[PDB]
Structures are given as structure tokens and as C-alpha cells.
């Protein structure tokens, strides 16, 4: 019964093995602990928004949306309808990005490595969408606690439609490479099986629940924005292993395509941030012509808006699971406390029980099926 | 509404079992994957010929910072310190005093590019379009010191890139 | 896509589908890189009258939380935090994969 230290995204793993079997597996984290939560207390709410881009850096606008929803709830305001539709559209695009990354990185770690390139071409196209709407490819800072920063450019919807109508064939090529392959099935079937009750007690969420047959999805049970106005299906697993979770992720990619089609067809007209200049900055022309607009611009960009005192826990169905924020306001323009809840934290904490009685080569598969990014785990 | 991803039970009819046995013994799905890779070999690759070909960008793109001026050549910055106040990374350092003609101007305007997160909050906080994020992104450096920009460097960047900067601002200002 | 007929047939037969119908490379079907100017409407608070800020002030309508059962100061049926969740329905679009 020897000990192995598989050290240096970046993870240290201390495990005891007897022969080939894994007897114990303790992850050591903190190699990407940046002290985000302490840094946020020294910023205004707008200044704190861009940290959520860097929390889970495969799904940026989803973290943006969660933070914005928390601040909106504390502010007792609501975004305009068009902003909500834009938010849900880009949230589904972000879900597509995250699921591509998760599945192709899983396959590459197993050894496939061709679908990685095949689908990172599509990832580059969606990065183009991000850049055209915000000017940045990944760290976008587009979704604000009053709506969105800017309206869409005049030809963006057409190009999103053109992209989304060919993506199903790319998913089909992915499935042709992976779904029915006997080597992939032997690497994934009956690996990392977790029961429903254990998954509930261990704090799992998202696919890690739905793979075990739990019928739960935050966009269906606790809808935010315009989600209750779109229809889609929730894929549900049956054996609670890596193979069922992979199938669930592919099906969620397809359902994201469905939701994106609906969002494209029902995009409404109007403004894109809340018409309340004490929260959302005025337009540049108004700022340069009106006294109140100039004053409110000055104060919003120097002091920031004050948030009434109180505490909220706001959670969303991020592509990796339930992503939450416990936000405490003391009445000023800077948050008093911001605790970030990342699903990968609980998933990595459950890695030890998920890898009991398995081979060393199965720990990589379990890590890939947990969909871990250490930016959100360490914060 | 929910769907089952893996809830199908295989047929027990002799034909289904023989088809599964043929799949096991003759490796039909492996041949199918090989055919997929073969078909992908014969389609045109997505590679562009950098640096002779470039990646498409938008007028909203955030690149290297620049300081602008009016058509008269007088600088737009009037040292309000709004960009310094809003900078999430505290990357802007500003010092100001009355000029020899009584004008409100800066004597120090520094941006530490190794602290900057390129969020563009400074250009949207500016009331006179003085500080902007330009279109240039190919400004890698061999030392850490050359990435600490002072006012002369930013004014030189503005004078270098003003044509493209003005065209981009003209293209995008009706959304701002 | 400028691929010969024989190469198109070979790649189609190897892939098992028609590839020219859904190409992953983009062509003149994308939108132009120069667009007309937008007009960008205004919001509902852009009225010239009947528009006092005290009637549309979200932040000032927030209140401190309601206190029930401060420890410092009937049949009685049992209750739950919310009504029980209703069972989901089985996707009369594609129930099984």
C-alpha cells in the first residue's frame, strides 16, 4: 500500500494505492487561491463585477448573470425585457461553450483528442460572438446589475442564426466518434457511480444530480429572467456513472440549441438597461447635454450606487451546476461580504468517495466527469 | 418535461443478438469512426495564414490604450480622475495642476499595463472621450519596464492610431 | 467550398451524410462588416410629465425584513415551507434517446 503525490488546470493529489486499486485519494487545493472574496470588499459593485468573469472562466456570462441577479434583488429593481432575453440567449451560448470544453477535455484526457479541435473551431466562432457584443473574447463584463452594457450590433442575430443551424451536425460528428465506441464505453460505463441520496447529502448539483435520476433543474423549478417563457427538456440519467453524465451533457447541448432558436425568434424591442439613472448610467448624449445626467454619470462612476442593507443568497443553473452568491450589503456602495458558492467545490470534495475501489486510470475519468475548473474552486 | 438519455433495452431476438455479435467480432463501429476521421481528412482546414491573414475583429474591440485630442490638437483630457476612480485594478495614476495658460491638464497620467484587466471601464467613464482602448493587440515586449506607460507613451499611441480609433468610434458611438 | 465532385462523394460516403449542405467554414452568407447606423429607442421613464421619481424609485421601496417570533418579547394544522412540487411530465417530443 504505497503513496503517490501527483502534483503539478493545476491540482495536487495525494493517494494511497494497494496494487492497482485506489484506497484513498485526497485532493490538495489552493494553488489558484487569489483571495477574490477579500478583494471584492474593497470595490464598488460595478468594480466587483469583473471578478465573476474570472471565477469560472469557461462560463463567464453565467457568473455575470448570477451576480447581477443578486445585486438586482438587493436593489429592488428589474431589468427590461429585452435585456432579459439577451441574457438568456447568451447564457445558452455560454452553456454550449462550457459543454464543448468539458466533453472535449474529458475525451482528450482519455486519449481521443480529435473532437477537441473539431469543436474548438465552433468555440472560436462563439468567441467571435462574445467579441462582437462586448469587445472581448472571454472576460466580457457584459451583463450588469441593471441589464446589459450595450445593445446588439445590427447584424449579430443573423450570424447567430447562421451558426446555430449547423451546430447539430458537429454534435452528431462528436457522437459518431464517442457515443457508441467500445473503448469509450469501457472507459466510462460503471465508473464513478454515485447514488441519489449520497449525491444529495454530499452537496452535488446539476448533472451530478441528474445522472443519478434526480429530476431537478434550477431553470425549471426556480426560473429567473425569461426562462419560464421557453420550452426545453431536461436529460435524466439512469445509472449515475460517467457515461450517463456524458450523454446528459450532449443532450443539454442539443436543448441549448433549441432554447437559442426560441430566443432568436422572440427577441423583443426596447431599451437594454433599467431606466433608472441612479442605478444605470445615462447615455453619452444625455450625459453631454443634461445636468442631471452628468451628475448621475459622475456619481455612478466615482462613488457607485448605494444598495439598501440586507443579505441574499441567489443561485442559478450554471453549466457546471448550482452557482450561488451570498451577498451582504451594509447600505453603502461597497459590498460588506460576498461569499461565492461554486459546484466544483462540493464535486471535488466528493471525489474521494467517487473513486473508491477503482483503478488509477479511472481517477482521470472521474475528474473529467466532475467538470472541475479551479478558478471557481479556489477563488 | 424530461427525457431519458439511456433507458433502452436491447432486443433478444436471434437477429438482434447476431447483429450485436457481428458488431463485436467484426468491429463495425470502429470502422465507422475511422470513416468519420477519413471524411474529415478530405475537407478544407480552417487554418489562416498568420501573420499574412488576420482574425476578424469588431469596432468594439479592446486593445492598447491611447490618449486622444481635439481636431485643434488640444488634448481632450481635463483631469477629472473619473477613469482613475473607476479602474477595478487601480492601474491608473493621475497628477494634475493648472497649465501655464490656466488650463486644467494632467502632469502625470500613468497606466500599468501589467495590472490592467482591459475591461474598458475607463473609456466608458470618460466624459470627453479622452482615454480609449484602441484596436492594436500586437504590442508584446521583452521587458516588464516597457509595459508601464507614462503620459508621453499614451499620447504617442493616440497620435499613432487616431485614424483607426476615430473610424471605430464613428462606427460604434450610436450604441453608447 | 471548392472541392471536386469525386472528393465530395468520397467525403460524403465516409462521413455518412451530405457535407455540402452544412459546412463548418463561413462564406458570403455572413453579415457585412459595415452596417447602417442604429436608432436605439428610449425607455419608459422618458416622459415629459407625470414622471416623478418618487413614483418609480425601487431602492426606496425596500424595507427591513419582517420579524416573526422574536424571543425577547386552536387546531393549529401543520404546514410545509411551500406546496409539494408536482411531478414532471415525460416530454411528448422525444421521451427516449
Amino acid at each position: 500500500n504505497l503513496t503517490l503525490n501527483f502534483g503539478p488546470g493545476v491540482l495536487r493529489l495525494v493517494m494511497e494505492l494497494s496494487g492497482e486499486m485506489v484506497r484513498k485519494c485526497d485532493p490538495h487545493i489552493g494553488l489558484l487561491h487569489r483571495g477574490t472574496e477579500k478583494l471584492i470588499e474593497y470595490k464598488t459593485y460595478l468594480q466587483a463585477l469583473p471578478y465573476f468573469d474570472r471565477l469560472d472562466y469557461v462560463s463567464m456570462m453565467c457568473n455575470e448573470q448570477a451576480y447581477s441577479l443578486a445585486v438586482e434583488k438587493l436593489l429592488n429593481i428589474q431589468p427590461p425585457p429585452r435585456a432579459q432575453w439577451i441574457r438568456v440567449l447568451f447564457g445558452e451560448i455560454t452553456r454550449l461553450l462550457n459543454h464543448i470544453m468539458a466533453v472535449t477535455t474529458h475525451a482528450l484526457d482519455i486519449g481521443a483528442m480529435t473532437p477537441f479541435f473539431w469543436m474548438f473551431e465552433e468555440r472560436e466562432k462563439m468567441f467571435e460572438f462574445y467579441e462582437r457584443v462586448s469587445g472581448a473574447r472571454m472576460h466580457a463584463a457584459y451583463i450588469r446589475p441593471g441589464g446589459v452594457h450595450q445593445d446588439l450590433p445590427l447584424g449579430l442575430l443573423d450570424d447567430i442564426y447562421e451558426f446555430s443551424k449547423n451546430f447539430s451536425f458537429r454534435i452528431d460528428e462528436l457522437e459518431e466518434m464517442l457515443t457508441n465506441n467500445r473503448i469509450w464505453r469501457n472507459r466510462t460505463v460503471d465508473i464513478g457511480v454515485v447514488t441519489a441520496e449520497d449525491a444529495l447529502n454530499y452537496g452535488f448539483s446539476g448533472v451530478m444530480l441528474r445522472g443519478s435520476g434526480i429530476q431537478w433543474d434550477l431553470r425549471k423549478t426556480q426560473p429567473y429572467d425569461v426562462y419560464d417563457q421557453v420550452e426545453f427538456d431536461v436529460p435524466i440519467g439512469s445509472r449515475g456513472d460517467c457515461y450517463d453524465r456524458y450523454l446528459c451533457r450532449v443532450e443539454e447541448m442539443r436543448q441549448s440549441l433549441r432554447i437559442i432558436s426560441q430566443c432568436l425568434n422572440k427577441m423583443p424591442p426596447g431599451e437594454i438597461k433599467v431606466d433608472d439613472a441612479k442605478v444605470s448610467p445615462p447615455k453619452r448624449a444625455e450625459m453631454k447635454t443634461s445636468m442631471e445626467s452628468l451628475i448621475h454619470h459622475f456619481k455612478l462612476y466615482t462613488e457607485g450606487y448605494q444598495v439598501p442593507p440586507g443579505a441574499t443568497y441567489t443561485a442559478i443553473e450554471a453549466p457546471k451546476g448550482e452557482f450561488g452568491v451570498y451577498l451582504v450589503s451594509d447600505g453603502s456602495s461597497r459590498p460588506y461580504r460576498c461569499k461565492i458558492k461554486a459546484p466544483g467545490f462540493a464535486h471535488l470534495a466528493g471525489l474521494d468517495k467517487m473513486s473508491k475501489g477503482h483503478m488509477l486510470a479511472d481517477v482521470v475519468a472521474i475528474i473529467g466527469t466532475q467538470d472541475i475548473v479551479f478558478g471557481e474552486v479556489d477563488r | 418535461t424530461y427525457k431519458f438519455v439511456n433507458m433502452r433495452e436491447p432486443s433478444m431476438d436471434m437477429k438482434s443478438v447476431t447483429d450485436r455479435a457481428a458488431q463485436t467480432l467484426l468491429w463495425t463501429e470502429l470502422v465507422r469512426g475511422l470513416g468519420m476521421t477519413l471524411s474529415y481528412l478530405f475537407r478544407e482546414p480552417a487554418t489562416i495564414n498568420y501573420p499574412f491573414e488576420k482574425g476578424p475583429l469588431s469596432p468594439r474591440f479592446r486593445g492598447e490604450h491611447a490618449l486622444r485630442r481635439y481636431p485643434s490638437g488640444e488634448e481632450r483630457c481635463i483631469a477629472c480622475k473619473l477613469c482613475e476612480a473607476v479602474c477595478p485594478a487601480q492601474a491608473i495614476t493621475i497628477e494634475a495642476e493648472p497649465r501655464a495658460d490656466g488650463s486644467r491638464r494632467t502632469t502625470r497620467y500613468d497606466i500599468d499595463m501589467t495590472k490592467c484587466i482591459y475591461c474598458g471601464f475607463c473609456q466608458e467613464a470618460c466624459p470627453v472621450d479622452a482615454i480609449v482602448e484602441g484596436p492594436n493587440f500586437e504590442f508584446s515586449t521583452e521587458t516588464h519596464e516597457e509595459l508601464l506607460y507614462n503620459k508621453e507613451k499614451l499620447l504617442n499611441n493616440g497620435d499613432k492610431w487616431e485614424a483607426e480609433i476615430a473610424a471605430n468610434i464613428q462606427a460604434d458611438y450610436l450604441y453608447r | 467550398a471548392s472541392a471536386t465532385r469525386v472528393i465530395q462523394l468520397l467525403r460524403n460516403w465516409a462521413s455518412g451524410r451530405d457535407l455540402q449542405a452544412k459546412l463548418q467554414l463561413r462564406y458570403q452568407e455572413i453579415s457585412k462588416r459595415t452596417q447602417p447606423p442604429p436608432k436605439l429607442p428610449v425607455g419608459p421613464s422618458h416622459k415629459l410629465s407625470n414622471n416623478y421619481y418618487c413614483t418609480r424609485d425601487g431602492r426606496r421601496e425596500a424595507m427591513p425584513p419582517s420579524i416573526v417570533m422574536s424571543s425577547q418579547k386552536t387546531e393549529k394544522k401543520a404546514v410545509t415551507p411551500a406546496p409539494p412540487i408536482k411531478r414532471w411530465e415525460l416530454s411528448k417530443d422525444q421521451p427516449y434517446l
Partner: peptide
């Protein structure tokens, strides 16, 4: 004079977007 102009879907909407899994059976017993 000028009316509102912003990025909108075309009149009549967009064409149907395929999303269902399509893995055909080539065919040989």
C-alpha cells in the same frame, strides 16, 4: 422623422433549426 432601428429578427422569424440527434444506420445484417 427617423424610426427606431435595432437588431431584430426578420419578419416571419427564422427558419427551423435542427437539434435532434441524427446517427443513421448504414445497413447490413
Amino acid at each position: 422623422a427617423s424610426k427606431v432601428k435595432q437588431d431584430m429578427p426578420p419578419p416571419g422569424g427564422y427558419g427551423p433549426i435542427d437539434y435532434k440527434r441524427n446517427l443513421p444506420r448504414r445497413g447490413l445484417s
